[model samples]
Target: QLYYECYSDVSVHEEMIADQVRTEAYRLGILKNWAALRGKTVLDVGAGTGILSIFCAQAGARRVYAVEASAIWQQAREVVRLNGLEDRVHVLPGPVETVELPERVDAIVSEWMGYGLLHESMLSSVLHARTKWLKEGGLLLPASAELFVAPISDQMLEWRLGFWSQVKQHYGVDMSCMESFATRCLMGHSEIVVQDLSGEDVLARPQRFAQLELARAGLEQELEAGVGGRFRCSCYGSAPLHGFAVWFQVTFPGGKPLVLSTSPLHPATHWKQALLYLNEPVPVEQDTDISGEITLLPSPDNPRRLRILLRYKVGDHEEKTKDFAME
Candidate 1:
């Protein structure tokens, strides 16, 4: 279901997928900046179908270790042989957490980032490999990553709540009530867009860093909500602030940072979409101070899912507080 949901859209516009991959590869500084890989051994973690490994081999790597968790290794190996580079590339099948390597490589690379960057926790395995197998001064393609957030308003909340309420109100007039159906449908399908200004010249600003770890399960186990912190916008503009957007940046240790803004200029990963909504709309005057707190809590049944509560205030008038959840 995961692969189907992701690939279904791409299969219709195949070039878009290829172009997105190319664009992301370049934007992440892998294409032009990988000049240092010539003659070096490269380890490609989570090497789905061995595409990145093949690219590494083509870049003149001396040896490439293609690691994958799925049975897809068979196809990756076939692709390597098809390219006549079977001798240089080796496909290893299994989880990286337990996989062993013959020798430390000069670099480790993978496309393991999920929404908000580390929500999937795939980097833990790569970090383990870095500690156990990577050589001293070895390059970690994405050595570090950071997550950011902001505040904004989404207009759909009012309509959605009103629609649900109307359905519930009609339950009094009929015995075959379907009000619960409306409630369930809205709970699962309702969404409001929160625009992140990371790429916008008018509202872009650094917010905060998200600490990712297996322990996040424990941290998010409780119930709570409201704004998480006060964010001050740095960019100057008069545009109506709808809601805040989240973005991420990956950086190699001692290397340049690759910013993944939630903007159309960059390829749209599932992560580019923002979570936005406001209990009520509030306007901010130019050069005036605005602040708010974002709330975080766990879903009622699912511990892995998170509920977000945000409260924004402009001067004395308190804006509406909104709540939502994301998995």
Candidate 2:
């Protein structure tokens, strides 16, 4: 199970918390939702290491059920008692979908999103919790999320392209013939790039392409979804448009919405950034525009596999499309 997948090491949680932006988002989400949790029951889906459960208990939840399927909960149990929250937080074991909480919850808290938002398929179980265990007027932490896209021109992308051209000289061998093959690897598919992006990399204004109202999503939504947008280049100077970059912002609205964004222009997080390197980088300045769409398809066979379709244009040139699978 995916829960056990990362429990094999402690570095997983380390990677998460070390990314202060991600950890604080949850801390702030709980703080922001504290009033609603005052006398209510809550569930922490995929509560590995029981971090979310601890946050809920600290936020004054009447009772918090920490559900996880991995052996990681053994240590997580100690964490609860160590924090003196053993009475408020219970490290319940097993998949959240099959676990019973004695009573329905008033809120469901989860850090279930993965790469590209839906890549890990954990949202399926989160939705299951909403449908099977949440009360009629319950809350979903970070209730809604919006996905965005924009044209990006990165120096690294440009460097990769030029690498092939100089490899022959560096090694005293003619490897320039492999340049096309290298480009195919980088551009013909979606690269699982988890690196920091710079503000200088953006060549066009960003636009929200898709949104998920977590409270309204369940079996009612399709397994596959698509979103398209139009953007005009906003570059201050001429630059090489490497490709498009994708990121998301999640909102938790109790009194008012508190948003956490993964944009290069914002604070860094574990998600870092996801980029779509172009097969052929485009040279553009102001007036150049790009329009395209991305389709997210959750596999019926393996939920961990998410298929994405990215297509866009660089000025008057023909449209370019690439298909990528995030596994």
Candidate 3:
């Protein structure tokens, strides 16, 4: 089960809670909106460790419902009690869809963004709670999110792709023919790579490819049908385009909206950046254009996973289409 696949390890929670950029943003996002949450009911979906619920309680919420689908709910209760807010915060041990709440909530707070903002698909649960338990005109902690893409040149990729070519020189046999097979195995279609990248690795300014406004209706259909956006990346100068790097930024709306971005342009977070490696790198000149379209589609086999389809062209090169699976 993906639940066990994700939450069984204590390190997972440790990674999340210790990510200062992430946890602190939520804390500030909640506290900064005190005027909006004070004396109101709040729902914390997937309340891993109940940290968000505690933050909401500190925000002066009248009552907080912390729904966690994993076994962590048991520990979440202990945490609530330890914080001495047991009476104020209710820890429900089950999926939000099945949990019963006494009344609609004034707002819903959830840290549901996964790698590239959709990998784990926890947003669906938050959306379920939003539709079922949030009061009309209710607030969602993260009002919207946007996914961005930028052209990149990765040395690691070049080394990996070039390794096969040198095998014949190192040995007496010619293994250069395995380049195609090696590329297929190493950076195969539909398989996404994740890593932290430096700003210098980016070859061009990134483009906001897809945007999701959580409060809007019909999002479920839009997500299921697949969301797409177009982009035209202008190279800063001569550079090798190994592939594209994707990241996300989420906005918590309030008097001073807070943005948490997992971009190479900002401090790195646990999510890092999702990379789509090309079978062959494209060499481009200054001011050259790498135009493309990107679409995020739910995996047919597992909705929690992500399938990225990219159609792009570098300079005057022939257009190339590729898809990657981010699981």
Candidate 4:
């Protein structure tokens, strides 16, 4: 209930709609796949402000079910009316799992990706909708998704930690004693950092840790067990391995497939890279093998929260394990 209440805020929807990269990707994906949606019934899971539902209506979908659990559905309905799409885009007020549709849909479209592609647990709802309402041969807008992780060298962290040592020289006092405490505070070992990164920050070739075929059956079973993959890559150059950066790429199928990637190599979007900082940085050499496995588990206490387990080794360094919770 708290989650739905939070989404009731208009600013949340505003931020999502203002994200040009995210919104444009959906717009183009829907239009490009017009053949699949034309005169077809579509389901817009977690519809929010109904933008994607409206886009489907504009793209020639005969009818669209905009299912929103939050109270924002009221405004989404108004938005549909304002856009003169109320006739085709029906703003349904409830969770997709419990909603009753007139019939099975021919397509499903949703913007369900969270910070690291699994934070919000919205995919479960989309999957449930898929099983409950989508026709056997129907289409999923983002047909597939791939989660990637790469070793990152964060120079800014070093500079930030170094500042504590220089404080004594400037203030005539050895506050450097707080360096360890500062590290703990700054690292926030259990927290996941949501920030923008660049290609220069990547220290190794990213490894795809998980892939989801939205239209494929049996994904829910894999997700239930916690999806993960192993990776081993040689370092590009000697650098400090702060931790790993995680991102995702989702592909929309059409005559010419379109992939929306949240990688540092691409333009920035609302879903920036998720940085899992280690307790401290580890130094590595060029050609060093940085290998690890990341398992994404749904929190037992809060299904919407993600509990990530990362076990990794940097070259000759001892293997290390860290656990983080993304809520």
Candidate 5:
């Protein structure tokens, strides 16, 4: 969940609507089980604008409870009415964690996935709702999800990131002087970075960083298992590794395992791509084993802000450990 309620600048729903990959996937998840939804009572945790609730209504769910905490509910009520789902979809203005519903639901549905699958901490509320409001063994709309990551070459980062050296030689500019006053800016892991890349941009094959079973997924990482695995791959030729690009996919169990992927290789989504830019570029060589250990942690003050520490070694350079954040 790159997150919906964030930045104090962008609207979560706006970014979501712009992301067809996300919207269409949810639509398919809701509609695919047409027969199962008929006469089923469903709950939409953290429902935004009642979209998911209305979709469930369209799927023939007899009743749907939409739990939304923001003032956006004033509009959600109207959206439900406009869709002529007022009878089936009821919008509740409050957190699903404490909201009381009339009855247990046959399914709990919500667009709870955030950037990197954990940035917003909304999954906690969704899981709480599933445990409290859903019937035993009820379906969870997004059955499972995963975060995948690999080292990547970002030209924008490679060409533009170095201020001091490049500014001095390329144009003889002294903006490098600005580096003294500038605080090092590291892009957090879940900022919803969307960029286009080729297989060439990827230095190595991506490994599944985290697999979150939607219903049973925990908020905290286990102390034993670190976030990512060791990656070893070769480049066809020389390249520059500016950073890593990440995307996620979710699966809903309907006719089969229905998947919605927001990968650069797939159709573009509003999430575009999530990029984690490095402080500098790493020169890449063919048939070389670029090695690294990437680990994720919780910021001391706020767990929603993930702490990403990457220890990497290229060619003969000293191993470098970079601390980054995602909030």
Candidate 6:
């Protein structure tokens, strides 16, 4: 099952991000990064709407393999026709993981990043293309990426946790004396404070966490945290530390990097926002470390499923832990 829902509702903010801004941004970024490739063959994976594919053509690519998996492929084809790029840009309809190409490419560009980078596992497909179709020294538009985390305060914790308490107290006498249900509902959920670690003053390297790319099939294996580190929400908001939001920066060798952010402040995408949670509230302290451990496990039923378990320790007295599964 697709754990994270991907709908193409043009009316929703998410769709706009997917069909409009993301493609434009990717196109601009790729053009800026690879300015000298006038006649190189370009491969645009997940070529939703064909924006990037068209851009590649505009940049003087000899040919572009526009690969897409969704019904959006129809829209992309139409876009190619509208842009008068049908002869130069070929639209392939299918998932990149299994799609076939007529020949190898000099460069591959894709916008497959999800919140936290690997949530959707699209990188796996990109890697497939790289291994099969990308020529030696061929560039990956986003040659690299990184992930970050932080801690923050929110009043919403009382509401989410207390809301369960009220429900239990009122129904305790009527139903069987099962407080386990309430406990399951509350403690089972946790929150995380996410922040972008790029841009002018944002921290870089050493302080930043490099996300694992599924492109490295071996590295896509399950990962677990022995300890959860502290995270501070740098934003000024009343929302509880529901979880961390994730963004990425793609860098091409010898080229400036482009950032892919998901914070609501930027734009809302189909990504449901990243959330790391604690079973209970740990009062915020100026520098209290939000320490936790995470475990990543491969699914027995699906190769794409990644199961995570996190345990957090706030200050000296309280500790919280949560579990999540993604595919």
Best by TM-score: 4
Residue lDDT tens for model 5, 1-327: 474655442377777866777888898888997777889999988788778888889888999999999877877899998988888899999898889899999998888765555556476677778878889878888887777777787655544445555677778666765543331443323333546665656677776666667666443334223355454445545787777766678888865778887676677666555666666556777765656666655567876555666676766677777766663
Per-residue alpha-carbon lDDT of model 3 for 240-272, expressed as tens digits? Answer: 788999999999987568999999989979999
User: TM-score per candidate, in order?
Assistant: 0.64, 0.88, 0.91, 0.94, 0.82, 0.71
Worst lDDT 10-window in candidate 2: 224-233
Clashes of 5: 6
- Arrange candidates by lDDT, descending: 3, 4, 2, 5, 6, 1
Between prediction 2 and prediction 5, which has the larger TM-score? 2
lDDT of 1 by residue, 188-262 (tens): 332433332324422434476353332123332322231144455432445445555555555533324564444
173: Cα error in model 2, Å? 9.3
Q: Least accurate stretch of 10 residues (summed lDDT) in model 6?
A: 198-207
- Model 4: worst 10 consecutive residues (lDDT sum): 1-10
Our model 1 lands, by Cα RMSD against the true structure, at 7.9
Clashing pairs in 3: 190-324, 190-325
- lDDT string for model 4 (135-252, tens) is 9888998899999999998767777877889898899878787878878897856988888888989998898988999877788887777878888899998787889999999999
lDDT of each: 0.57, 0.78, 0.89, 0.88, 0.71, 0.58
Better of 1 and 4 by TM-score: 4
Give the residue spans of candidate 6 off by over 4 A: 1-21, 155-187, 190-207, 212-248, 252-255, 263-272, 295-298, 318-321
Name the regions of candidate 1 deviating beyond 4 angstroms. 1-28, 153-230, 234-242, 252-260, 264-267, 283-288, 292-325
Candidate 5, lDDT over the whole model = 0.71
